[PDB]
Amino acid sequence: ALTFAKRLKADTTAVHDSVDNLVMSVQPFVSKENYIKFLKLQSVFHKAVDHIYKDAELNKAIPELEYMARYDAVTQDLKDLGEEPYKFDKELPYEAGNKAIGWLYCAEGSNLGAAFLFKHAQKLDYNGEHGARHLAPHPDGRGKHWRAFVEHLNALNLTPEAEAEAIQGAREAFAFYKVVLRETFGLAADAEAPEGMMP
Numbered sequence: 571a572l573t574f575a576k577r578l579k580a581d582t583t584a585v586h587d588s589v590d591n592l593v594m595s596v597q598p599f600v601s602k603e604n605y606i607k608f609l610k611l612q613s614v615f616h617k618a619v620d621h622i623y624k625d626a627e628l629n630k631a632i633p634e635l636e637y638m639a640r641y642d643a644v645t646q647d648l649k650d651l652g653e654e655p656y657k658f659d660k661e662l663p664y665e666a667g668n669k670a671i672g673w674l675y676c677a678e679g680s681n682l683g684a685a686f687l688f689k690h691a692q693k694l695d696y697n698g699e700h701g702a703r704h705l706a707p708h709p710d711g712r713g714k715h716w717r718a719f720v721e722h723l724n725a726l727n728l729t730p731e732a733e734a735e736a737i738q739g740a741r742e743a744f745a746f747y748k749v750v751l752r753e754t755f756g757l758a759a760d761a762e763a764p765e766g767m768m769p
């Protein structure tokens with residue numbers, strides 16, 4: 571690639587697309603019941619990275635990182651749908667160090683690419699003020715907000731060795747997402763979208 575952020579993307583695009591395909595395959599927008607299952611999935615993942623967004627060390631290198639967390643937004647979307655806060659059945663990952671940087675990339679990048687999901691949530695009359703608060707674009711714009719974030723990520727100046735761990739972290743974050751999705755939508759372990767499906 572060329573930069574840390576670009577290597578992260580390059581090394582995780584295949585798994586990202588597998589997530590895209592799996593999410594769409596379980597029909598998150600076919601019914602209120604399924605959208606709620608989607609929100610529970612989102613709730614678990616965002617709870618899992620909450621401690622990373624609030625990490626003292628990372629907030630010193632990335633100013634205002636603590637305010638980027640979307641866990642509260644997802645929980646409010648659950649409230650809008652008449653659901654109480656959702657709590658994962660199993661123990662939640664609590665990553666740290668370089669691997670935690672990979673999870674942060676995964677979670678924040680999902681904010682950049684949430685435009686598609688937000689459009690379809692809108693079809694159900696769910697918007698940034700009701701039901702899809704966690705999918706709404708950052709006030710500064712998805713792209714502008716992301717580019718600023720990417721600068722900070724690259725500015726961590728992680729060594730090639732550290733990058734490897736972070737990238738592995740990002741891969742594990744996506745992997746965890748699918749594990750939670752399968753449990754939430756009642757799929758077998760390692761279930762995937764129909765083979766050959768394109769994002």
Ligand code: HEM
Nearest residue numbers: 579589590591593594675676677678679680682683686747
């Ligand atoms: C059906 C659901 C999804 C679709 C259609 C999708 C689509 C996309 C698209 C088109 C982008 C690029 C946006 C841009 O460059 O402006 C993107 C980026 C990204 N998405 Fe998703 N995504 C989905 C779900 C997720 C999930 C659930 C995660 C992780 C838990 C995720 C993590 C990311 C990351 C990390 C990036 C950043 C890529 C980069 O480095 O440029 N996405 N997504």
